[PDB]
Amino acid sequence: MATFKLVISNPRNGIARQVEISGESAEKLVGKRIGDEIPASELGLNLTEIFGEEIPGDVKLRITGGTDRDGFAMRPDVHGPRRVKILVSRGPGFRPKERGERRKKTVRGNTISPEIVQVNMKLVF
């Protein structure tokens, strides 16, 4: 399959909702990178959606990241759909405790693939 759990985030409210897509909408998301806007109109999810009120105009989604089935987060700095194991020193995919820790962490690349599960989406007005 190509199903995806999208966490949509409204910054106007500071609020978020999880919605699972499972078909050709998901397959349309496939191939997109962090930084790529998409409209909920074609994506399928309604506009009086789970936020209930404060309905948008036809506000457009934008990808911000997400994790895969094995738990590794996409890093926009990395190009491709595949995983790498890199020294990072502060990035998404690493929460450093000491001042100069620099651990090597496995991450996923920016562009979406079937192996993704969590997909973070800010709605952009």
Place this chain on the structure above:
Amino acid sequence: MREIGLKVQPPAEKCDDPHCPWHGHLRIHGRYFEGIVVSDKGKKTVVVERRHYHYLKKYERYELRRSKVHAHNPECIDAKVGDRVLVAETRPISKTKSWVVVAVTKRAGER
């Protein structure tokens, strides 16, 4: 003319490298001794030999012990093989050189 800390006659001519105590910026500190030159091949580099006697507690006797030092030789003091030079300790000038010749008593003849 400067008066480096140990009273002995300076050279006559005054033109040298900065690694000369009197005419350059080299400093001397620590220990100083007289010794005999046994090599003068290297440019601005001689080998000075001491000869002290070492006591053996067991055999109640003495043995000679030679010690070379590898000093710097400024052209104002062009000490040659045989001369009783005065040598003094300074900073490292090379891998082996940490000493500098300052004065001479020449020796055309030896035994």
Place this chain on the structure above:
Amino acid sequence: RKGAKRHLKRLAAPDQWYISRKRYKWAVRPRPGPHSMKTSIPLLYIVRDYLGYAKTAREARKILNEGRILVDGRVRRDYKFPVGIMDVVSIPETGEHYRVLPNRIGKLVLHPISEKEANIKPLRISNKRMVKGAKVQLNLHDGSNHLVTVDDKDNYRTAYTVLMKVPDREVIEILPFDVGAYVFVTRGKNVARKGKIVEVRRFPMGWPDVVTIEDENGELFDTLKEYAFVVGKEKPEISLP
């Protein structure tokens, strides 16, 4: 190995502390401070062991943090603070003053004194820089520093002594290093010995200068100029032993 020392073992301690070296494992490592490790002892040992106002370091630290012990007119709350030669340790609540001075054995002792002398501290000058502003910084043996001017820069010389009023730091009574000057030795073999200077020898290179000193009983002994501390012109005037 990888860095500095934060500890001290009581056997590896200075030889001039009166410490009871085998009773425990550890000793107070002195902080960096006025004097050196060779001419100091920590205030904890002074409060607990010498004077006996505490059997325990917790009591001593409580005292020091209450502020009952001055060192040259200043409250010292740190138990690792170095207290050195010719230092004045005052306890006002008890009306006591002590001069830290060395013994003939070479160890540091507290000589009792009164308030008048307790407002005095003699300082061997020990160096003299020219600092910005074209001012003269006297660099004194307690690691202290005094600024003077290019007018009396010549009245101030290196091995001289300066009497100092310490809670204010006002120079009184410069005492020069000359012949006839009364002197108190601080280190060496002839440690807590005193007398008048007789001679000085120079010794070309970095070999330290040496002074010949005449005691009260007419004897005549040498030591180092750096270990010769001037206390007076003809009389010690600081109540030494």
Place this chain on the structure above:
Amino acid sequence: MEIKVREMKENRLLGRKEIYFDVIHEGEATPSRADVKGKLVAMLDLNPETVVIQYIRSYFGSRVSRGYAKAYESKERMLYIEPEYVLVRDGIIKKEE
């Protein structure tokens, strides 16, 4: 029991009289801190609320024990300076749970 004081020195820094004393207990066991404290306040009209006994040590072949006690000017100084185990021993404090 017989108390015989050796030394009684003041400490204004901490605020306490420090008493060193002998307890002669010929023929009896070395006495209890309670009894020693009572006899001590009597011998010296001290405030038992502030008197604290540090040690009573009996030696080999002596039946003359040696003791160190402390007499604070204030119970608050006593509770601040003196440690909890000493206070518990003299019974000033019931261990707090």
Place this chain on the structure above:
RNA sequence: GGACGGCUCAGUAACACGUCGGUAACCUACCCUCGGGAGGGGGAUAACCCCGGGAAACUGGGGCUAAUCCCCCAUAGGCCUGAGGUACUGGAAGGUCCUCAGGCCGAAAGGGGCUCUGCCCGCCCGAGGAUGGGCCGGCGGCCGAUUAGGUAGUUGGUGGGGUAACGGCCCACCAAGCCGAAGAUCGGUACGGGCCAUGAGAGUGGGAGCCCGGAGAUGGACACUGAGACACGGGUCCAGGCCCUAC
């Protein structure tokens, strides 16, 4: 703050150790003294809230906020060079200081608490000291000649680079030096010492336990951060081995 302490003695025949000395060839947070300063702006982000992902280890997105967090500007200050004056110390000035030039780098938390108009704990710069180290040198301490020639950046020099700092430490170019039969080189063994055992002593032997120093943290190699580590309870890779796993 964690670079101490604590453990071990593999390696190492070496300036590793001991001792005398040197650093005018260097670094030093905490601490002391003195002398000065704290001006003007700005920003983000944890915690928290919404939603989570992943077997775990771990980790994402959005919203919100502060600081003794972070950034900027200027003033001080720091470094280099050039010129000259000769006030300082030193045994001796490539040092300090004074004046002038050209430049580059470039601070700070007037923060917090009280009995608040004063006090306490604090921030930055400079000068020195102290503390702790780095580096240099003289002397000193095993075996083997069925190990005799060794060395090729090797010895030195000129000029540089680099370093906290001197240095063939490294580089370019010049030369042919350096070590050695008083035993080099190679091999063997070994942490060094204070000390210990023994013995009339001379001496022979040992150098786990306590202190001092050194080195190492499965083997090997490399870095980040920090005053300080190439870091036993931090990081990365290889080798080797083991553990959990939803492989």
